Amino acid sequence: DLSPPSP
Amino acid sequence: QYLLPEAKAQDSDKICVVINLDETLVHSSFKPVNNADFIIPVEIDGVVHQVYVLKRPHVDEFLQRMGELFECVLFTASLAKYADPVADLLDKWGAFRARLFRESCVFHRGNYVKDLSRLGRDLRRVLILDNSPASYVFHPDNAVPVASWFDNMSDTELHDLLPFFEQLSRVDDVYSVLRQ
Ligand SMILES: [Mg+2]
């Protein structure tokens, strides 16, 4: 979830 | 206004490469990881938590050579509060000439998209290296796929991709290789 696809 | 300033004179003739961070160059989680490469304290809703960072194999050979071959740009959908410390520790040679975070992405149909049209660079001389094909939906002919990495220490993709980037760094128009 650090670089997430979507918030 | 474009995402990047004008390229410095030592970068101007080089091809631009936007490079992803998470699952491309490193993998992190909040779940404690023994023998981590870096631990970064990251405040979330006012509580600091430790983020455990693993370096993908060969990433130093990769960044160090990439910074010679290209105008490299870090481009991630994570926040700078996490990315800047990671990048400070990874980029031992000044490979990344600029850093672009979540606020620089485009949100498109549930996905954060790195819209390459906003960098301010001739797209014939722009590449994107990203593990998430959704990140480059608008510029698929600009992309060098790379598999998402988590902890497989046998992985060699960054190593294996270099001779191909060696070719790409010398062409006039990346689409002559990637077909567009
Ligand atoms: Mg990624």
Structure tokens given for B179: 């077909």
Residues B149, B114, B128, B134, CA torsion sign? positive
Number of Cβ within a 10 Å radius of residue B117: 13
Q: Determination technique for this PDB entry?
A: X-ray
Nearest CB among B21, B82, B132 relative to A5 is that of: B132
B177 in Cβ contact with B171 (< 8 Å): yes
Q: State the best of A1, A2, A6 to mutate against chain B, taking most chain B CBs within 10 Å.
A: A2
Name the amino acid, one letter, at B153.
Answer: M
Cα end-to-end distance, chain A, whole Å: 9
Q: How many helices (H) and strands (E) does chain B have?
A: 4, 10
Cα–Cα–Cα angle for B149, B155, B157, nearest 5°? 80
- CATH number for region B1-180: 3.40.50.1000
Are A4 and B112 within 8 A, CB to CB?
yes
Q: Do B82 and A6 touch (CB under 8 A)?
A: no
Give me the residues of B, 92-121, that contact A with CB < 8 A.
110-112
B53 beta partners: B28, B38
Q: Say if residues B59 and B74 touch (Cβ distance below 8 Å).
A: no
Where are the domains positioned within chain B?
A: 1-180
Tell me if chain A has a CB within 8 Å of the CB of B131: no
Question: How deeply is B15 buried, as exposed, middle or buried, from its count of CB atoms within 10 A (0-12, 13-18, 19+)?
Answer: buried
Specify the DSSP element, H or E, that contains B84: helix B80-90
DSSP B1: -
Strand ranges (E), B30-158: 38-44, 47-55, 71-75, 96-100, 106-108, 111-113, 126-130, 143-145
Is A2 close to B132, i.e. CB distance below 8 A? Answer: no
Q: Do A3 and B78 touch (CB under 8 A)?
A: yes
